[PDB]
């Protein structure tokens, strides 16, 4: 068995994060869009 499956049989479990990789990617895309289209106005008020 792999390392994860061999360590889970002793109590050690890996909990999944709340924000998945897709949500972090969407957040980064939104930040990039705000930086390109607006600049610094979207981090201080209206875009």
């Amino acid at each position: 068995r792999d390392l994860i499956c061999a360590q889970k049989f002793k109590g050690l479990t890996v909990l999944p994060p709340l924000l998945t990789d897709e949500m972090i990617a969407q957040y980064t895309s939104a930040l990039l869009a705000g930086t390109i289209t607006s600049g610094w106005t979207f981090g201080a008020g209206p875009a």
């Binding site: 889970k8 479990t13 909990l15």
Partner: peptide, 29 residues
């Protein structure tokens, strides 16, 4: 998962590391 004893008494059970086959139900990651 409990919304608080001051609001209601319903609870939700999450079994970490199962497939809804060895415990409505909802299968998540």
């Amino acid at each position: 998962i409990t919304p608080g004893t001051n609001t209601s008494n319903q609870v939700a059970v999450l079994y970490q590391g199962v497939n809804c086959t060895e415990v409505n139900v909802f299968q998540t990651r």
